[PDB]
Write a structure and sequence with these properties.
blood clotting; 19 residues; little secondary structure; Tissue factor; 0% helix; PIN1
């Protein structure tokens, strides 16, 4: 919920706009 938090262990489930 808002901000980077940690970098991956935040939630991980998006393409995050890699392509």
């Amino acid at each position: 919920c808002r901000k980077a938090g940690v970098g991956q262990s935040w939630k991980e489930n998006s393409p995050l706009n890699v392509s």
